[PDB]
Amino acid sequence: SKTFIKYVSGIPDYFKQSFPEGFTWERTTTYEDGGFLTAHQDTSLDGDCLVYKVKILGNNFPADGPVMQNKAGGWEPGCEILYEVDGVLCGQSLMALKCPGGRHLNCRLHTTYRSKKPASALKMPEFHFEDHRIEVKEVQKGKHYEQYEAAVARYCDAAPSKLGHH
Amino acid sequence: SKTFIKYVSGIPDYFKQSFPEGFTWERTTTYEDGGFLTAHQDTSLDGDCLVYKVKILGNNFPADGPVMQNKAGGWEPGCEILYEVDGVLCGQSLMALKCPGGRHLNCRLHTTYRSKKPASALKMPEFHFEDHRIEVKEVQKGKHYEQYEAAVARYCDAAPSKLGHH
Amino acid sequence: SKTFIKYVSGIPDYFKQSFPEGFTWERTTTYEDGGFLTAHQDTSLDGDCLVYKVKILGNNFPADGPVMQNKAGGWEPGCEILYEVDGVLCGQSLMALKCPGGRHLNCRLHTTYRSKKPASALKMPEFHFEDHRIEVKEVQKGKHYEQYEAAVARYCDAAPSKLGHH
Amino acid sequence: SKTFIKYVSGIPDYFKQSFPEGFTWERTTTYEDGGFLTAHQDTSLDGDCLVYKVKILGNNFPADGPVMQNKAGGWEPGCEILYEVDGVLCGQSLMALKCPGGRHLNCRLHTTYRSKKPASALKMPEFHFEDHRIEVKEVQKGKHYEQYEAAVARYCDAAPSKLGHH
Amino acid sequence: LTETMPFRMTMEGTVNGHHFKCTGKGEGNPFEGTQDMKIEVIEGGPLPFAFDILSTSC
Amino acid sequence: LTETMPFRMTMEGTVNGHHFKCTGKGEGNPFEGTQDMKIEVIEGGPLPFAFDILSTSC
Amino acid sequence: LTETMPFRMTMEGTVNGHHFKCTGKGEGNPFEGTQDMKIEVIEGGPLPFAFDILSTSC
Amino acid sequence: LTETMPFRMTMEGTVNGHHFKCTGKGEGNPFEGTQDMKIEVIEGGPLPFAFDILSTSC
Numbered sequence: 001s002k003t004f005i006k007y008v009s010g011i012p013d014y015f016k017q018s019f020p021e022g023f024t025w026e027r028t029t030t031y032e033d034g035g036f037l038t039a040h041q042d043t044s045l046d047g048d049c050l051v052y053k054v055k056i057l058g059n060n061f062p063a064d065g066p067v068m069q070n071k072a073g074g075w076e077p078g079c080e081i082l083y084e085v086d087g088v089l090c091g092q093s094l095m096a097l098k099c100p101g102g103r104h105l106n107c108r109l110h111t112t113y114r115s116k117k118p119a120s121a122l123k124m125p126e127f128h129f130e131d132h133r134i135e136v137k138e139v140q141k142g143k144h145y146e147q148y149e150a151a152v153a154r155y156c157d158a159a160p161s162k163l164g165h166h
Numbered sequence: 167s168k169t170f171i172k173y174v175s176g177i178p179d180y181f182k183q184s185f186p187e188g189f190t191w192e193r194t195t196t197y198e199d200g201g202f203l204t205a206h207q208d209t210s211l212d213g214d215c216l217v218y219k220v221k222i223l224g225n226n227f228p229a230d231g232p233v234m235q236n237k238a239g240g241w242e243p244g245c246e247i248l249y250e251v252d253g254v255l256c257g258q259s260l261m262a263l264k265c266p267g268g269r270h271l272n273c274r275l276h277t278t279y280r281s282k283k284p285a286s287a288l289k290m291p292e293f294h295f296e297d298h299r300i301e302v303k304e305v306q307k308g309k310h311y312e313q314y315e316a317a318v319a320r321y322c323d324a325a326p327s328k329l330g331h332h
Numbered sequence: 333s334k335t336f337i338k339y340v341s342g343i344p345d346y347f348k349q350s351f352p353e354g355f356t357w358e359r360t361t362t363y364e365d366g367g368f369l370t371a372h373q374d375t376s377l378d379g380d381c382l383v384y385k386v387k388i389l390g391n392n393f394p395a396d397g398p399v400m401q402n403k404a405g406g407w408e409p410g411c412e413i414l415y416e417v418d419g420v421l422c423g424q425s426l427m428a429l430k431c432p433g434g435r436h437l438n439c440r441l442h443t444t445y446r447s448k449k450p451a452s453a454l455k456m457p458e459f460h461f462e463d464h465r466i467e468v469k470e471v472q473k474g475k476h477y478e479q480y481e482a483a484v485a486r487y488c489d490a491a492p493s494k495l496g497h498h
Numbered sequence: 499s500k501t502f503i504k505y506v507s508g509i510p511d512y513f514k515q516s517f518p519e520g521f522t523w524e525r526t527t528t529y530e531d532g533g534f535l536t537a538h539q540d541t542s543l544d545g546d547c548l549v550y551k552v553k554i555l556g557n558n559f560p561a562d563g564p565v566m567q568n569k570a571g572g573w574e575p576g577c578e579i580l581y582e583v584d585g586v587l588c589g590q591s592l593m594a595l596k597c598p599g600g601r602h603l604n605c606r607l608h609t610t611y612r613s614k615k616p617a618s619a620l621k622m623p624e625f626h627f628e629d630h631r632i633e634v635k636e637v638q639k640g641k642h643y644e645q646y647e648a649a650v651a652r653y654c655d656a657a658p659s660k661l662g663h664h
Numbered sequence: 665l666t667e668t669m670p671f672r673m674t675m676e677g678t679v680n681g682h683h684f685k686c687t688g689k690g691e692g693n694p695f696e697g698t699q700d701m702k703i704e705v706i707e708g709g710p711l712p713f714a715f716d717i718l719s720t721s722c
Numbered sequence: 723l724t725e726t727m728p729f730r731m732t733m734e735g736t737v738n739g740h741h742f743k744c745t746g747k748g749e750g751n752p753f754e755g756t757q758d759m760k761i762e763v764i765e766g767g768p769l770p771f772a773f774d775i776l777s778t779s780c
Numbered sequence: 781l782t783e784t785m786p787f788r789m790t791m792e793g794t795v796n797g798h799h800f801k802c803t804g805k806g807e808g809n810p811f812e813g814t815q816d817m818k819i820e821v822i823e824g825g826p827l828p829f830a831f832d833i834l835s836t837s838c
Numbered sequence: 839l840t841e842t843m844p845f846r847m848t849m850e851g852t853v854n855g856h857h858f859k860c861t862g863k864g865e866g867n868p869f870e871g872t873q874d875m876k877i878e879v880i881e882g883g884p885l886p887f888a889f890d891i892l893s894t895s896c
Contacts (some may be wrong), residue, residue: 001671001688001692001699001701001722003665003669003671003694004669004692004693004694004697004698004699005344005694005697006695006696006697012670013696015666016694017271019665024739026194026223026225026226026295026736026738026739027225027720027721028194028202028204028225028226029717029720030196032462033529034276036194036204036276037679038194038202038204038223038225038713039223039677039720040223040225040736040739048669048670049670049672050669050670050671050672051492051668051671051672051673052671052672052674052688052722053673053674053675054598054673054674054675054676054714054721054722055223055675055676055677055736056675056676056677056678056679056718056721057192057204057205057206057223057677057678057679057719058677058678058679058680058692058713059192059193059194059204059206059223059276059278059679059680060192060194060256060276060277060278060680061679061680061713061717062251062252063252064252067713067714067716068712068713068714069713069714070712070713070714071714071715072716074716075716075719076413076459077487077488077491078413078667079411079461079708081410081411081426081438082426083406083436085228085231085435085436086228086229086230090226090677092426092428092438093426093442094413094424094425094426095444095720096413096415096424096459097665097714097716101695102416103417104415104417104459106413106424108426109224109720110200110202110225110226112226112738114704114739118474127408127428127436128692129409129411131488131490131491132491133488133491133492133684134491134493134719134720135493135497135673136492136715136716136719137715138715141710142439142705142709142710142711143704143705143709143710143711144702144703144704144705144711144716145702145703145704145715146700146701146703147690147701147703147719147722148494148698148699148700149698149699150491150492150698151491151697151698152490152491152697154490154696155409156409156463156465158463158484158486159409159464159465159482159483159484160465160482160869162467162480163467163469165467166694167748167752167757167759167780168770169723169727169729169750169752170727170750170751170752170755170757171752171755172753172754172755177743182723182752183571185723190681192678192680192681193778193779195775195778198366199365200364201526201775203737203758203775203779204749204769205778206678206681211745214723214724214727214728215592215728215729215730216727216728216729217729217730217731218729218730218731218732218733218743218746218780219733220731220732220733220734220735220779220780221678221733221734222733222734222735222736222737222776222779223735223737224735224736224737224775225560225737225738226738227737227738227771227775232774233771233772233774233775234738234770234771234772235772236769236771236772237772238774238775239774240774241741241774241777242579242625243653243654243657243741244579244657245552245577245579245627247574247577247592247594247604248588249602250600250750251601251602258592258594258604259590259592260582260591260606260627261778262579262580268582269583270583270625272579272590274592274725274771275778276608278680280681284756288725292727293574293594293602293774295575297654297656297657298657299654299657299658299659299663300777300778301659301660301661301663302773302774302777303501303737304773305760306761307768308768308769308770308773309762309763309767309768309769310760310761310762310763311741311760311761311762311763312746312758312759312760312761313758313759313761313765313777313780314660314756314757314758315757316657316658316755316756317558317755317756318656318657318658318755319755320656321575322575322629322631324629324650324652325575325629325630325631325648325649325650325813326648327631327633329633332745333845333866333873333875333896335839335843336640336843336866336867336871336872336873337867337871338869338871339870339872341544345857346866348839350840352585355867356797358524358555358557358558358794358797358892359557359894359895360528360536360557360558361871361891361894362526362528363854364862366608366885367891368534368536368608369853369891369892369895370526370534370536370555371555372555372557372794372797373895376865377894378834380843380844381844381845381846382843382845383846383856384845384846384847384848384849384862384896385847385848385849385852386847386848386849386850386851386853386893386895386896387555387794387849387851388850388852388853388885388892389524389536389537389538389553389555389851389852389853390609390851390852390853390854390891391524391525391526391536391608391853391854392524392526392588392608392609392610392854393853393854393887393891394583394584395584395585396584397892398888398892399844399888400854400885400886400887400888402885402886402887402890403887403888405889407893410884417560418560418561418562419561421849422558427894429888429890441894442532442534442557442558443558444557444558444796446797446876447859455858456634464852465877466893466894467892468889468893470879470888470889471876473883473884474879474883474884474886474889475877475879475883475884475885476877476878476879477876477877477878477879477889478874478876478877479864479874479893479896480874481866481872481873482871483872484871485871486859491697499787499806499808499817499838500803501781501785501787501810501815502785502809502813502815503810504811504812504813511814514781515781515809517833522836522855524838524852524854524855525836527833527836533832534837535832535834535837537836537837538852538855539837544787546782546785547786547787548785548786548787548788549787549788549789550789550791550804550838551789551790552789552790552791552792552793552837552838553791553792553793554792554795554834554837555793555794555795556792556793556796556829556833557794557795557796558796559796559829559833564830565809565830565832565833566828566829566830567830568799568827568828568829568830569830570830570832570833571810572832573832573835579818586793593836595832595858597829604782604827607836610854612809612855614814619827627803632818632835632836634831634832634835636831639825639826640821640825640827640831641820641825641826641827642818642819642820642821643818643819643820643822643831644816644817644818644819645806645816645817645819645835645838646814646815646816647808647814647815648812648813648814648815649813649814651813657755661789
């Protein structure tokens with residue numbers, strides 16, 4: 001839900017800038033055990049309501065893996081890198097799924113974010129990071145879930161530059 | 167169209183064995199320039215007509231690449247390796263797309279083939295190869311196409327064993 | 333140079349713990365344009381001096397790419413995720429190389445860090461992050477370089493948990 | 499040992515052409531369970547003796563996997579695709595390692611073969627295939643081995659073109 | 665956009681041959697970067713796979 | 723089955739934000755491993771990408 | 781080339797922290813594409829991993 | 839460790855067929871996580887590729 005990000009240090013907000021038109025995103029997530037999860041999403045503004053429409057295709061998840069065995073323990077917090085490619089915004093991230101026995105299963109997210117506004121009408125952000133944290137509670141088995149996420153967009157303040165870069 | 171394969175050397179035919187029920191397949195193709203093409207397919211037999219239903223999600227294709235610039239010259243012939251995992255049939259292949267200037271763009275196909283018959287009802291093939299050749303003719307720009315494919319399933323006869331395996 | 337990291341939030345320091353025995357690391361970096369850079373490194377302590385021995389094998393870099401054309405402009409700051417796998421510490425990171433015309437070339441680092449100390453003498457850290465910034469100055473073309481790095485190991489303080497997790 | 503290949507259908511032999519100068523090859527093999535094996539090789543002719551010098555860096559193999567547990571049962575036969583990229587010969591292949599319980603572990607080989615001969619003295623082959631069969635005998639555990647290989651370079655004769663392509 | 669913003673979601677897909685549909689409703693603070701939502705599996709439930717693989721799509 | 727088998731196809735998808743629909747029909751010899759087909763882009767045409775990426779799905 | 785050709789090999793490597801060295805001696809038929817060789821682990825043996833990972837480098 | 843620590847480095851490699859060797863000398867603040875070094879290409883120079891690919895190794 002890319003509209004809900006705290007942007008610091010004056011980084012342009014590609015997603016909020018896109019309204020009222022909205023934006024789309026497309027992603028393939030590659031899992032280290034051979035699974036793939038591909039998604040396309042449309043984000044629109046219907047007056048005072050945001051409308052998300054998502055299409056999902058997932059495949060090759062091992063039958064004995066934590067995904068198909070339904071033994072996943074949620075995601076670790078993650079960092080995404082974002083930068084312009086071909087006049088749109090690209091995103092790249094690694095995530096880690098918590099597994100039984102204190103193990104992790106990693107994956108890579110390959111994302112392109114596409115504004116429905118033309119590039120000429122937008123202020124494109126420079127290379128930056130988005131910190132994310134996703135938390136899930138299963139209310140009813142395989143039926144009802146609740147999900148929380150916090151997200152911040154920033155430069156690298158933690159490790160400072162000598163060359164005066166961001 | 168996996169029903170149309172010539173099987174030699176007595177290799178069991180996972181696909182033809184699956185009728186009348188039919189089968190599904192699922193695939194993610196990863197392109198060396200960052201594109202992804204994900205597909206799910208359902209194959210059914212309606213009388214004596216085969217019915218294919220396909221869902222496609224493709225993403226991250228470079229704007230300047232041969233795919234989005236519509237400058238591809240068709241596929242080279244290819245080889246797929248197939249073998250059982252988790253009681254279904256898995257396939258893996260590398261393909262090479264012909265590009266302007268006698269160049270190639272490669273990709274990897276990650277496939278799972280799923281019979282609608284239970285595993286107990288099929289004879290599962292051993293590790294084998296499937297040779298394929300796909301040829302396309304564009305009848306009308308972006309609208310009408312013709313496609314030909316020849317496919318043969320075999321063991322490795324070209325390079326013989328000293329240990330007496332196929 | 334993994335000995336030089338600032339650890340916060342009571343995260344144990346796998347690298348400093350490894351002295352006097354030291355540690356090794358091993359990595360393959362996969363570049364999005366098809367290059368691979370593989371390294372093995374040995375870290376030892378010799379009196380009051382740290383000694384690094386590095387072996388490198390790089391391959392498949394495109395002749396026309398920023399690496400082989402020597403037109404790279406340094407790395408963006410990066411984020412590594414680190415966690416235990418089978419008694420050693422694994423690291424995963426995406427990095428982005430600055431290219432001509434404000435473009436970026438991304439890559440993925442697959443690392444295993446191996447203490448030379450027995451596991452009985454070590455406190456393995458929980459899942460955490462290392463922020464890195466690397467800056468290079470070319471003093472003499474292809475002959476003399478200077479490199480600066482700053483590194484900090486942390487949890488995700490920027491996006492807080494509703495469940496009170498790290 | 500790329501000198502030992504049977505070429506059919508008038509395909510030029512990049513490797514034999516390279517003598518007396520010889521050739522090198524460089525490769526990263528990526529395993530589906532996270533291992534990487536990188537090699538660089540030098541091939542020279544010394545009188546009537548071919549001389550191979552090989553450097554290897556392998557990393558990230560799972561401690562529990564068939565490789566580190568030494569429970570591998572050899573390779574299935576394989577098919578490599580080869581084609582020119584920027585004046586040198588590139589090779590791409592998928593291989594399958596036999597594992598306990600009739601299982602397989604797959605990997606991908608990314609190779610560049612580099613003649614030590616000037617490009618002016620070389621006939622570059624068109625896109626083609628190399629069929630390989632490798633068989634290993636362990637004579638003394640972890641110390642003495644014997645290896646056999648058969649290799650043939652060909653076009654796709656098994657699945658014919660309707661357009662008269664190779 | 666307002667300081668507290670609601671959203672709704674429709675999702676459809678196939679994972680390992682399993683077809684499913686989901687609906688969602690939520691709210692968040694666009695400028696603080698926080699949000700919560702409910703997800704219901706309306707078709708193909710109970711989900712025969714870990715819901716976690718759908719989290720980044722929701 | 724028969725010596726020559728006919729088949730029909732319906733396809734829907736999105737590639738780089740472009741939605742399209744395709745239909746097809748063809749014929750082949752199941753035991754000889756050969757086949758031919760026609761594909762028509764019925765929605766989202768003319769295809770704004772190389773058709774080659776859809777070949778293995780047709 | 782002669783229709784039978786001998787070869788020799790030296791190999792140095794590190795796999796998962798384990799250092800090793802191998803030598804090899806073989807012969808084959810260059811134009812017929814067949815070959816056989818012996819490989820000996822001269823340092824770092826017995827090999828603490830499957831030799832099969834070294835096969836394509838021999 | 840002392841709050842300031844020196845280090846020395848030797849590197850040997852091959853990239854795309856190009857063999858090279860480097861030496862390095864540096865110092866840093868181990869607990870503060872900062873460091874600086876000089877790197878000299880002692881063999882195979884001037885480097886026929888971007889030094890940046892070696893940065894994470896130095």
